[PDB]
Design an enzyme around this catalytic site. Structure first.
Site, PDB file in Angstrom:
ATOM      1  N   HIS A 218       5.174  -7.781   6.013  1.00  0.00           N
ATOM      2  CA  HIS A 218       4.483  -7.644   4.338  1.00  0.00           C
ATOM      3  C   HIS A 218       5.028  -8.661   3.633  1.00  0.00           C
ATOM      4  O   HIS A 218       5.019  -9.348   2.700  1.00  0.00           O
ATOM      5  CB  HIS A 218       4.780  -6.265   3.643  1.00  0.00           C
ATOM      6  CG  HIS A 218       6.717  -6.328   3.421  1.00  0.00           C
ATOM      7  ND1 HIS A 218       7.329  -6.956   2.571  1.00  0.00           N
ATOM      8  CD2 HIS A 218       6.934  -4.664   3.677  1.00  0.00           C
ATOM      9  CE1 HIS A 218       8.290  -6.675   1.762  1.00  0.00           C
ATOM     10  NE2 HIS A 218       8.656  -5.091   3.211  1.00  0.00           N
TER      11      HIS A 218
ATOM     12  N   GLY B  48      15.050  -7.827  -1.836  1.00  0.00           N
ATOM     13  CA  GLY B  48      15.378  -9.014  -1.287  1.00  0.00           C
ATOM     14  C   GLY B  48      15.925  -8.720  -0.110  1.00  0.00           C
ATOM     15  O   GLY B  48      16.126  -9.141   0.992  1.00  0.00           O
TER      16      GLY B  48
ATOM     17  N   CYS C 220      14.679  -6.441   2.245  1.00  0.00           N
ATOM     18  CA  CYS C 220      13.466  -6.145   3.405  1.00  0.00           C
ATOM     19  C   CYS C 220      13.844  -6.753   4.951  1.00  0.00           C
ATOM     20  O   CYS C 220      14.507  -7.802   4.861  1.00  0.00           O
ATOM     21  CB  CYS C 220      12.013  -6.509   3.091  1.00  0.00           C
ATOM     22  SG  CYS C 220      11.626  -4.798   2.276  1.00  0.00           S
TER      23      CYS C 220
END
Ligand SMILES: *C(=N)[C@H](C[C@@H]1CCNC1=O)NC(=O)[C@@H]1[C@@H]2[C@H](CN1C(=O)[C@@H](NC(=O)NC(C)(C)C)C(C)(C)C)C2(C)C
Ligand SMILES: *C(=N)[C@H](C[C@@H]1CCNC1=O)NC(=O)[C@@H]1[C@@H]2[C@H](CN1C(=O)[C@@H](NC(=O)NC(C)(C)C)C(C)(C)C)C2(C)C
Lengths: 306, 306
Positions: free
Chosen positions: A41, A143, A145
């Site tokens: 993503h 932030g 991920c």
């Protein structure tokens, strides 16, 4: 003596964490040999997230759209591909700090350490369990991920989790390192909800054994029970059923303490029915289910790693 | 979202841990530049521990009586001296992995991460607080002495604890890195006991703020109180008194949530008097006091390190 929620030492993973930027979005990546793994993503814009077509979005990107930073060094991306929900960025430099590693897909009830990262830099490490409903109760902010979960077995880092998203109940969902989600989740902003969770019975028993090893014995009793009578009680209370495999797993702890598994089940049955009545076990007033039988052995026997 | 007992990443410390053997006793040492720090009781035999004369025992040793191993490499000891309760072994090689570091003596109520080690090798990392009675509730087995506690501030490792002993209640006592014990303990096997412990009030308030930040608001109320009325209640329950310094420390959390400190004290007062009545806060059924106000900010704002 003592009993703490203990994480694995994080040093071997810290040297694999990098920062990945695509467009206006920056998250973390995992750099092993000459490949950087990160959530796919990262290629979405705000427009894209309700229903992205990841194959379309990726075909419109080139190597130079991906900025990979290892500290201050920039890594040159020389190829990219998608595997399930992870992006794989081939880079021109193999990480010299690559540990011995494998990728493992874990089952519910197993525990692992999470190295929480922002902008490629480690913020903190903590232990958590894969819940029966395939979420984890983590601690993650914007932030985060790309932060990974792992275990260590002797000299080998087993990576088992990469972080992708938070659900509206405040729990977390992500993939194995081959990009397959745990659970029925998808990486798009559509309505999704965790199933109902259950308590991991075999872990609660392991933790009661730890309590005995540390001198907390007030809940013990002389009774015993059978698996079938136990499981009938446990299901009333939203506990996972106990199998013969679980009984065998608890063997080393039963032997060390001289308390038979089905004896300890009789104690747990009492605790479920009458409650704890303002007493504590190992400093907790709730029954704890995020320690596996192996976690207890490791911490009450002193296993190390190299 | 989420809230976990989070330790600092341990990588910078892992590379400083070594094994120290003297006679039949092996424990851990801390290797910084060309000095190895370890508990001085490594020089005692079974005979010596009831009342050792450490100056006598050390004068009878030579450099070659100390075996220092960094992995498989043996380090050559070229001098030794004693500072308070720590031994300092000068070695012929400066650790190339020495981080930026300082030595700090902490106060009760502060938290730090422990890297538990056996035979020079990291076993696991966990967070704990220095209790008001100058013990820590750690998790340590035979061979763990010399394991260290630390914090990280930007790029700098602050070492604050070295492990020396377990007390009969199952809690732990040790020194700063200049060898001074925390608390009234001594490194000999004479009868010693921890004073009575108290609950760290400013940390309980910080954790209630974390609960609010994460959506747990059921304990809030419209009342308010004064410091003097609060402290009168807190002392009945074995809570540390609250100072104006504590109130100011909690400023950033009060501002972020819009709940005044003395408002939150009124909630805590209610929780002390009526109890929690089978409800939980942040997944706990007891009031938690091992998170400092800085720990909460760090974890609810996402601070990292380099
Ligand atoms: C990764 N850097 C963040 C991690 C988030 C930030 C807050 N805590 C976390 O765990 N993850 C994401 O940005 C993912 C990613 C897009 C939105 N999203 C979310 O985590 C959102 N959740 C969300 O939309 N959940 C439902 C169940 C799909 C509605 C958010 C930001 C927490 C509202 C995508 C899912 C592609
Ligand atoms: C260091 N390697 C061990 C760490 C111990 C092992 C079990 N858990 C721990 O924290 N520490 C020691 O060996 C120290 C060292 C001699 C004995 N001792 C102890 O920790 C003992 N405790 C002890 O004697 N306590 C009183 C209060 C002094 C009676 C022991 C082994 C836990 C019974 C000395 C103190 C020099």
């Amino acid at each position: 003596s003592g009993f703490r929620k203990m994480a694995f030492p994080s040093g071997k993973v810290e040297g694999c964490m990098v920062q990945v930027t695509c467009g206006t979005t920056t998250l973390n990546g995992l750099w092993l040999d000459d490949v950087v793994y990160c959530p796919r993503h990262v290629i979405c814009t705000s427009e894209d997230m309700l229903n992205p077509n990841y194959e379309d979005l990726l075909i419109r990107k080139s190597n130079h759209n991906f900025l990979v930073q290892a500290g201050n060094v920039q890594l040159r991306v020389i190829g990219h591909s998608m595997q399930n929900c992870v992006l794989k960025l081939k880079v021109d430099t193999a990480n010299p700090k690559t540990p011995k590693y494998k990728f493992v897909r874990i089952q519910p009830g197993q525990t692992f350490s999470v190295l929480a990262c922002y902008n490629g830099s480690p913020s903190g490490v903590y232990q958590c369990a894969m819940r029966p409903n395939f979420t984890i109760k983590g601690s993650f902010l914007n932030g985060s991920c790309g932060s990974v979960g792992f275990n260590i077995d002797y000299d080998c880092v087993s990576f088992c989790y990469m972080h992708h998203m938070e659900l509206p109940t405040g729990v977390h969902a992500g993939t194995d390192l081959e990009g397959n989600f745990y659970g029925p989740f998808v990486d798009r902003q559509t309505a999704q909800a965790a199933g109902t969770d259950t308590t991991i019975t075999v872990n609660v028993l392991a933790w009661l054994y730890a309590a005995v090893i540390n001198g907390d014995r007030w809940f013990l009793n002389r009774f015993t029970t059978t698996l079938n009578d136990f499981n009938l009680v446990a299901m009333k209370y939203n506990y996972e059923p106990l199998t013969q495999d679980h009984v065998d797993i608890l063997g080393p702890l039963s032997a060390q303490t001289g308390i038979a598994v089905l004896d300890m089940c009789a104690s747990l049955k009492e605790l479920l029915q009458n409650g704890m009545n303002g007493r504590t076990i190992l400093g907790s007033a709730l029954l704890e289910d995020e320690f596996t039988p192996f976690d207890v052995v490791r911490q009450c026997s002193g296993v190390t790693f190299q």
